[PDB]
């Protein structure tokens, strides 16, 4: 019964401030690092904050560096995020994420339901091209997003987190990193690659398989999220 | 490599928790019971493995071991108690009048304990179990029934001065192992506060050794 | 006559 | 007899401390606070033994072997090791007091993390107690007074005495006597007395004469003769040989070190 | 009494255990040499691992 | 019919001993002169796995050599990344007197057993974040001595009540039971195929068993005191027995007799653990001589010592790949000994 729900936001006056909070239950969140993924409407995702397992290495994105602050209440199993002096670009939907970091762990596996925030009006990026290749449920589709540098490290773990933002709810972790499958995902969603190439090999499609996919990068310091995609029904 | 940094941080957190657990682990005593089935150690704890009786007497938690129900060969599992503060031994004082053998297995096991390669420093405590019944037994019958060379004198003091001295002569390491002695009087405090004093003394000696004084 | 010598 | 006395007190003294460090590092790791606490003063003595030839040059009539070495930072570096070693010795006394008298709360300061922070504190306080000497290090070598004018040399040494003996070796290293108050196999009392009295007696017998004579020197600088040049040399020799008595005493009296030595 | 059953148990082993070929130590040694050459090449405790990034010998 | 059955039993012993002597023309030490000695095997302590604060009673490695689980008297079953000296988990133990730990072949489960006679089994890869116990295994009236997983749902346990038993952790009840021993059973070793296993008892008797039925497939003697360590050969048709008589003995399933002895004049210390390398050529055994004397199994000649421990080498075992050997001893530490190039 893992449950991630967040609240706070929905309408922001220009030049104003807002507060975010994410509630965790059903798992040992105190030993879990957590990310923060925004989502502009009719667009892709965007990482906004991060704190490691145990409030060790607090991180922030350049676009909100200084403006935002992220803190975890481990005894209370809830997250606190304060956004001050919000600009017009902060018209997006947030997504609480969890992460456990150990040898062969499951990072960015469970995503929160989502809280949308609306305001009235030098690092690596990945190529979320091929906006839509719709296919009948009786076929296979391979997705990919490209990275300039070689993903593999001396450890061999390549971080090209795969997700599928199905309409109406949060993306489901298909393959954390780029090699190992996830908990709860079926056998259809697979993946393979060699250094810089990759292939999100999907066997069959059905009603649930619709949704825009996204990719994350955890190699460098900033978690550049994936650009908008189409369900490619 | 960021994932590796987070893993290293999680391991450092686990190290911080491990040290906080291990300081308490080193603070905890390991008082081990020993004896025979007829020793009657149940009385001591009155006030399918070990019944690890964790209690606290003077703000220092004591982990007593009711391992008397092991019913196994102690030679193959007594090396698990090499590091203990003390070892409590309830003597078989039933040799006064009760036979079966008038508690010569007590000496047979005490000599093995004393000469064991793992109990050189372990200050074994000797408890005169069933002292109340043994006093009446020695008042009603002599002690030379199974101790022909002893004096006896049909007195409580001489009963101790003979029986206890029989095993304390088998005690060879008079310099390293400091054996205590407390007649088991069925009272509320003096049965376990003496054990507390003895474990404090042995902990003080071990601390002096560790610090190098 | 002071530190370590005179 | 400086030509023989200096060699005798600087060869065995410098070798024993190095041997103690080697055994305490290799034969018995002993991450225990006490092992690195005594290693601190062992290293202090090892790097402080080099002052014996430097002071023997006074009787050798060679004010400097190179010329800028003897007066620039010799009294600023070798002399700093005196306060370093006294601070480390009182650190060891405090460590023993916390380990024996009161492990009630031994997870706050007796952890290995604090055992090196205290050592670093001792080193920096020794440097700060010797930094004025370096700032005033310009003479003919002692220079704490020549550089200033009025009485700063006398003020220095008074502060040096008050910081080297008054606090650490009179009431702080006296914690050894307080350690046994209630915890002194009744022969263990004498066995531990033969270790708790001898250390304090050595520290107060071999090290006090240096500070007592110079404070007298502060009072009255007596006229010199071979008596003065020989016995004031013996006083500093005893002050230096306290640093030879300490390592052997610590490495032989301790039973763990006895097992470590026999390892 | 139970001894009989236990004797039968004793034989239970002696009977079948010896009933089978009970091959000689002759063969016992064989694998010591074949499997040695089989898994000793994979015995890093024996053939030190010089992997540029040996899991432990770095 | 006491003497009547004794005569038949003596006839049986005579027949089987004569068969052993006929098959065993001579000790294998003489016939092994063909193979070259391994020589002095210098094993540098490549990683010193510090962090454990009591005597290490049993160290076990998961099917991936990266992870290990080390059990000690402090009640800390700690999963370790031997690659980076990292603590993946630190499982608290219900019983702190563990003398055996087990890494499941799936890797999802870890078990520990000891004095309390229950082999509690822990869930490593849970949906939540922590590691939780799956099911304890009560039913042993002795002291548990060696758990070794057969599969995810079958735990083998040898105890001090002179018996051993197979379990099904789905229900918590023993499917079979193996009572053929007279003294406390100390070391149970599971085969690579897990269809058979060997448990050693204090009566200097080691008895092979069949997992599916519960009947003693074989018995072995030759030791003069209590056996303290048994571990199967990688080939799965052997084992070695290090006993408190200061020797270790190599056995065979098809020969039903002792083959080698691992003792020397200068060693009078009893063995506290035994393990084999990937090829079996090194039989690393942790003596109480404070040095995990690496005994060349095929030569029965001491061809290496890993003396690096202040106390007795309590437990040790190679990994799945054998890239490491972690002689976590009664000294608080574990050391990853690897051959340095």
CSV table of N, CA, C and O in Angstrom, one decimal, chain F residues 58-60 69 77 95 98-105 110-115 117-122 135-137 140 143-150 154-159 164-165 167 169 185-190 197 199 230-231:
chain,number,residue,atom,x,y,z
F,58,UNK,N,29.8,-16.2,11.5
F,58,UNK,CA,29.6,-16.8,10.2
F,58,UNK,C,29.4,-15.7,9.2
F,58,UNK,O,28.6,-14.8,9.4
F,59,UNK,N,30.2,-15.8,8.1
F,59,UNK,CA,30.1,-14.9,7.0
F,59,UNK,C,29.6,-15.7,5.8
F,59,UNK,O,30.1,-16.8,5.5
F,60,UNK,N,28.6,-15.1,5.1
F,60,UNK,CA,28.1,-15.8,3.9
F,60,UNK,C,28.0,-14.8,2.7
F,60,UNK,O,27.7,-13.6,3.0
F,69,UNK,N,27.0,-11.3,3.7
F,69,UNK,CA,26.4,-11.1,5.0
F,69,UNK,C,27.2,-11.7,6.1
F,69,UNK,O,27.6,-12.8,6.0
F,77,UNK,N,23.3,-8.8,11.9
F,77,UNK,CA,23.5,-9.3,10.5
F,77,UNK,C,23.6,-8.1,9.6
F,77,UNK,O,22.6,-7.4,9.4
F,95,UNK,N,18.0,-12.9,17.8
F,95,UNK,CA,19.0,-13.6,18.7
F,95,UNK,C,20.4,-13.2,18.3
F,95,UNK,O,20.8,-13.3,17.2
F,98,UNK,N,24.1,-15.8,17.2
F,98,UNK,CA,24.1,-16.5,15.9
F,98,UNK,C,25.4,-17.1,15.7
F,98,UNK,O,26.5,-16.5,15.8
F,99,UNK,N,25.4,-18.4,15.3
F,99,UNK,CA,26.6,-19.1,14.8
F,99,UNK,C,26.5,-19.5,13.4
F,99,UNK,O,27.4,-20.2,12.9
F,100,UNK,N,25.5,-19.1,12.6
F,100,UNK,CA,25.4,-19.4,11.2
F,100,UNK,C,24.5,-18.4,10.5
F,100,UNK,O,23.4,-18.0,11.1
F,101,UNK,N,24.9,-18.0,9.3
F,101,UNK,CA,24.1,-17.1,8.5
F,101,UNK,C,24.0,-17.6,7.1
F,101,UNK,O,24.9,-18.4,6.7
F,102,UNK,N,23.0,-17.3,6.4
F,102,UNK,CA,22.7,-17.8,5.0
F,102,UNK,C,22.2,-16.7,4.1
F,102,UNK,O,21.3,-16.0,4.4
F,103,UNK,N,22.8,-16.7,2.9
F,103,UNK,CA,22.3,-15.9,1.8
F,103,UNK,C,21.5,-16.8,0.8
F,103,UNK,O,22.1,-17.8,0.3
F,104,UNK,N,20.2,-16.5,0.6
F,104,UNK,CA,19.4,-17.3,-0.3
F,104,UNK,C,20.0,-17.2,-1.7
F,104,UNK,O,20.5,-16.2,-2.1
F,105,UNK,N,19.8,-18.4,-2.4
F,105,UNK,CA,20.3,-18.3,-3.8
F,105,UNK,C,19.5,-17.3,-4.7
F,105,UNK,O,20.1,-16.8,-5.7
F,110,UNK,N,17.7,-13.7,3.6
F,110,UNK,CA,18.8,-14.0,4.4
F,110,UNK,C,18.3,-14.6,5.7
F,110,UNK,O,17.3,-14.2,6.2
F,111,UNK,N,19.0,-15.6,6.2
F,111,UNK,CA,18.6,-16.3,7.5
F,111,UNK,C,19.8,-16.4,8.4
F,111,UNK,O,20.9,-16.4,8.0
F,112,UNK,N,19.5,-16.4,9.7
F,112,UNK,CA,20.4,-16.6,10.8
F,112,UNK,C,19.9,-17.6,11.8
F,112,UNK,O,18.7,-17.6,12.1
F,113,UNK,N,20.8,-18.4,12.3
F,113,UNK,CA,20.4,-19.4,13.4
F,113,UNK,C,21.5,-19.5,14.4
F,113,UNK,O,22.6,-19.1,14.2
F,114,UNK,N,21.1,-20.0,15.6
F,114,UNK,CA,22.0,-20.1,16.7
F,114,UNK,C,21.4,-20.8,17.9
F,114,UNK,O,20.8,-21.8,17.8
F,115,UNK,N,21.7,-20.2,19.1
F,115,UNK,CA,21.3,-20.8,20.4
F,115,UNK,C,19.8,-21.0,20.5
F,115,UNK,O,19.3,-21.9,21.1
F,117,UNK,N,17.6,-21.8,18.6
F,117,UNK,CA,17.1,-23.0,17.9
F,117,UNK,C,16.0,-22.6,16.9
F,117,UNK,O,15.2,-23.5,16.5
F,118,UNK,N,16.0,-21.3,16.4
F,118,UNK,CA,15.1,-20.9,15.4
F,118,UNK,C,15.9,-20.2,14.3
F,118,UNK,O,16.8,-19.4,14.6
F,119,UNK,N,15.6,-20.6,13.1
F,119,UNK,CA,16.3,-20.1,11.9
F,119,UNK,C,15.4,-19.0,11.3
F,119,UNK,O,14.8,-19.2,10.3
F,120,UNK,N,15.4,-17.8,11.9
F,120,UNK,CA,14.6,-16.7,11.3
F,120,UNK,C,15.1,-16.3,9.9
F,120,UNK,O,16.3,-16.3,9.7
F,121,UNK,N,14.2,-16.0,9.0
F,121,UNK,CA,14.5,-15.7,7.6
F,121,UNK,C,14.0,-14.3,7.3
F,121,UNK,O,12.8,-14.0,7.6
F,122,UNK,N,14.8,-13.5,6.7
F,122,UNK,CA,14.6,-12.1,6.5
F,122,UNK,C,14.3,-11.8,5.0
F,122,UNK,O,14.9,-12.4,4.1
F,135,UNK,N,9.7,-15.6,8.2
F,135,UNK,CA,9.1,-16.5,9.1
F,135,UNK,C,10.2,-17.2,9.9
F,135,UNK,O,11.2,-17.7,9.3
F,136,UNK,N,10.0,-17.3,11.2
F,136,UNK,CA,10.9,-18.1,12.0
F,136,UNK,C,10.6,-19.6,11.9
F,136,UNK,O,9.6,-20.0,11.5
F,137,UNK,N,11.6,-20.4,12.3
F,137,UNK,CA,11.5,-21.8,12.2
F,137,UNK,C,11.8,-22.5,13.5
F,137,UNK,O,12.9,-22.9,13.8
F,140,UNK,N,13.2,-27.1,16.9
F,140,UNK,CA,14.4,-27.7,17.3
F,140,UNK,C,14.6,-27.5,18.8
F,140,UNK,O,14.6,-26.4,19.3
F,143,UNK,N,20.4,-26.6,19.9
F,143,UNK,CA,20.9,-25.3,19.5
F,143,UNK,C,21.2,-25.3,18.1
F,143,UNK,O,22.0,-26.2,17.6
F,144,UNK,N,20.6,-24.4,17.3
F,144,UNK,CA,20.8,-24.4,15.9
F,144,UNK,C,22.2,-24.1,15.5
F,144,UNK,O,22.8,-23.2,16.2
F,145,UNK,N,22.8,-24.7,14.5
F,145,UNK,CA,24.2,-24.6,14.2
F,145,UNK,C,24.5,-24.2,12.8
F,145,UNK,O,25.5,-23.6,12.6
F,146,UNK,N,23.7,-24.6,11.8
F,146,UNK,CA,24.0,-24.2,10.4
F,146,UNK,C,22.7,-24.2,9.6
F,146,UNK,O,22.2,-25.3,9.3
F,147,UNK,N,22.2,-23.0,9.2
F,147,UNK,CA,21.2,-22.9,8.2
F,147,UNK,C,21.8,-22.7,6.8
F,147,UNK,O,22.8,-21.9,6.7
F,148,UNK,N,21.3,-23.4,5.8
F,148,UNK,CA,21.7,-23.2,4.4
F,148,UNK,C,20.5,-23.4,3.6
F,148,UNK,O,19.8,-24.4,3.6
F,149,UNK,N,20.2,-22.3,2.8
F,149,UNK,CA,19.0,-22.3,2.0
F,149,UNK,C,19.2,-23.4,0.8
F,149,UNK,O,20.2,-23.5,0.3
F,150,UNK,N,18.1,-24.1,0.6
F,150,UNK,CA,18.1,-24.9,-0.6
F,150,UNK,C,17.5,-24.2,-1.8
F,150,UNK,O,18.1,-24.1,-2.9
F,154,UNK,N,12.8,-23.4,1.2
F,154,UNK,CA,13.3,-24.6,1.9
F,154,UNK,C,14.5,-24.3,2.6
F,154,UNK,O,15.6,-24.1,2.0
F,155,UNK,N,14.5,-24.4,4.0
F,155,UNK,CA,15.6,-24.0,4.8
F,155,UNK,C,16.1,-25.3,5.5
F,155,UNK,O,15.2,-26.0,6.2
F,156,UNK,N,17.3,-25.6,5.4
F,156,UNK,CA,17.9,-26.8,6.0
F,156,UNK,C,18.6,-26.3,7.3
F,156,UNK,O,19.4,-25.3,7.3
F,157,UNK,N,18.4,-27.1,8.4
F,157,UNK,CA,18.9,-26.6,9.7
F,157,UNK,C,19.4,-27.8,10.5
F,157,UNK,O,18.6,-28.8,10.7
F,158,UNK,N,20.6,-27.8,11.0
F,158,UNK,CA,21.2,-28.8,11.9
F,158,UNK,C,21.4,-28.2,13.2
F,158,UNK,O,22.0,-27.1,13.3
F,159,UNK,N,21.0,-28.9,14.3
F,159,UNK,CA,21.0,-28.3,15.6
F,159,UNK,C,21.8,-29.1,16.6
F,159,UNK,O,22.6,-29.9,16.2
F,164,UNK,N,18.7,-33.2,12.5
F,164,UNK,CA,18.7,-32.1,11.4
F,164,UNK,C,17.3,-32.2,10.7
F,164,UNK,O,16.7,-33.3,10.8
F,165,UNK,N,16.9,-31.2,10.0
F,165,UNK,CA,15.6,-31.1,9.5
F,165,UNK,C,15.5,-30.2,8.3
F,165,UNK,O,16.1,-29.2,8.3
F,167,UNK,N,12.8,-27.8,6.1
F,167,UNK,CA,11.6,-27.0,6.4
F,167,UNK,C,11.0,-26.4,5.2
F,167,UNK,O,11.6,-26.3,4.1
F,169,UNK,N,9.1,-22.8,4.5
F,169,UNK,CA,8.9,-21.6,5.2
F,169,UNK,C,7.5,-21.0,4.8
F,169,UNK,O,7.1,-20.0,5.4
F,185,UNK,N,25.1,-31.6,16.6
F,185,UNK,CA,25.5,-31.4,15.2
F,185,UNK,C,26.0,-30.0,15.1
F,185,UNK,O,25.3,-29.0,15.5
F,186,UNK,N,27.2,-29.8,14.5
F,186,UNK,CA,27.8,-28.5,14.4
F,186,UNK,C,27.8,-27.8,13.1
F,186,UNK,O,27.4,-26.7,13.0
F,187,UNK,N,28.1,-28.5,12.0
F,187,UNK,CA,28.2,-27.9,10.7
F,187,UNK,C,27.5,-28.7,9.7
F,187,UNK,O,27.8,-29.9,9.4
F,188,UNK,N,26.5,-28.1,9.0
F,188,UNK,CA,25.7,-28.6,7.9
F,188,UNK,C,26.1,-27.9,6.7
F,188,UNK,O,26.0,-26.6,6.6
F,189,UNK,N,26.5,-28.6,5.6
F,189,UNK,CA,26.9,-28.0,4.3
F,189,UNK,C,26.0,-28.5,3.2
F,189,UNK,O,25.8,-29.7,3.1
F,190,UNK,N,25.4,-27.6,2.5
F,190,UNK,CA,24.5,-28.0,1.4
F,190,UNK,C,25.2,-28.1,0.1
F,190,UNK,O,26.2,-27.4,-0.2
F,197,UNK,N,23.0,-33.3,1.6
F,197,UNK,CA,23.8,-32.4,2.4
F,197,UNK,C,24.4,-33.2,3.5
F,197,UNK,O,23.9,-34.3,3.9
F,199,UNK,N,26.0,-33.1,7.5
F,199,UNK,CA,26.0,-32.4,8.8
F,199,UNK,C,27.0,-33.2,9.8
F,199,UNK,O,26.9,-34.4,9.8
F,230,UNK,N,32.3,-28.2,8.5
F,230,UNK,CA,32.1,-29.0,7.3
F,230,UNK,C,31.6,-28.1,6.2
F,230,UNK,O,30.8,-27.2,6.4
F,231,UNK,N,32.2,-28.2,5.0
F,231,UNK,CA,31.8,-27.5,3.8
F,231,UNK,C,32.0,-28.3,2.5
F,231,UNK,O,33.1,-28.8,2.3
